[PDB]
Design a protein around this ligand. Structure first.
Ligand SMILES: [Zn+2]
Ligand SMILES: [Zn+2]
Lengths: 176, 173
């Protein structure tokens, strides 16, 4: 099965997003690149930041805007999938999620769906309580859970952290 | 010489703060913990976030310390950072006096000095220009060996924490 490597700030952003809002399902886009046979996840962007607080995984206009912006980044990054939370429901793809993931794979064969259920992590504050999986649909149409590692290659760790920090939609007050 | 292990989000926050002010020196606090003989830097926080020359501000440092204390990640103030845009990376006479005062309070305290100009221009990691210093028993300024922290569990813990402390209401402009 394809290995997935997630750099730590991408995962932190997913988790913070999911755990921040336990009474609803949140979603966003995964940003990264292939590294030989491994799919690397460098960043995660919320639907909210692009104006879509629910179901941004289905929002083609947002995907095109994110893709156009990455067109400039010059780290050679692209959309690699989508994420969403399932608070209190555990981690799986629903029938609708499967259809969404099939469409993602049509546009990029290595696309993945990260599903997180942050409830236990919110309760214990231990990262070990996190429940998440990264899925693809197999060629036989089966949902498969992929092996996930944390990315630690030092140069890419630095680059990915600097990138993911730069895209975090921090709260701010503008000067006039 | 003491090894310094800096987790990547802490570095990134220092550099982002420094690169946001290319026409003036900025400063902040380093947060971390000792891991045997190694000093770990887990986070870097600005004075602004606590109301702040923050490296000299004992009221802020006490507030930062109190708050770190109540959370149980066993993190502490372990030094200070500041930028020298366009001037390269050294400790000035004034910085040396500041650093001596830090080491009086915590023997492993360090001074990170960053010159963000090349990084601001290229956005390449290879353009980073920074050093981490202590003052020796003889009064010499020692540049310490620096590694990037990659231990998987601490890398996650430090990243999740440093993101949490970044996410405040920034007053810009
Ligand atoms: Zn779902
Ligand atoms: Zn200085």
């Amino acid at each position: 099965h394809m290995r997935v490597r997630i750099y730590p700030l991408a995962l932190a952003k997913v988790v913070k997003h999911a755990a921040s809002s336990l009474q609803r399902e949140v979603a966003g886009l995964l940003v990264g690149k292939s590294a030989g046979k491994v799919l690397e996840i460098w960043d995660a962007v919320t639907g909210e930041q692009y104006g879509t607080p629910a179901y941004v995984q289905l929002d083609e206009m947002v995907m095109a805007k994110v893709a156009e912006e990455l067109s400039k980044s010059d780290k050679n990054l692209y959309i690699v999938g989508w994420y969403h939370s399932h608070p209190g429901l555990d981690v799986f793809l629903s029938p609708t999620d499967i259809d969404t993931q099939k469409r993602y794979q049509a546009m990029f064969s290595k696309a993945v769906a990260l599903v997180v259920d942050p409830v236990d992590y919110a309760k214990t504050r231990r990262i070990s309580s996190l429940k998440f999986k990264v899925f693809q649909i197999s060629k036989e149409g089966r949902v498969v859970s992929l092996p996930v590692s944390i990315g630690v290659h030092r140069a890419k760790l630095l680059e990915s952290t600097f990138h993911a920090l730069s895209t975090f939609d921090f709260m701010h007050i503008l000067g006039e």
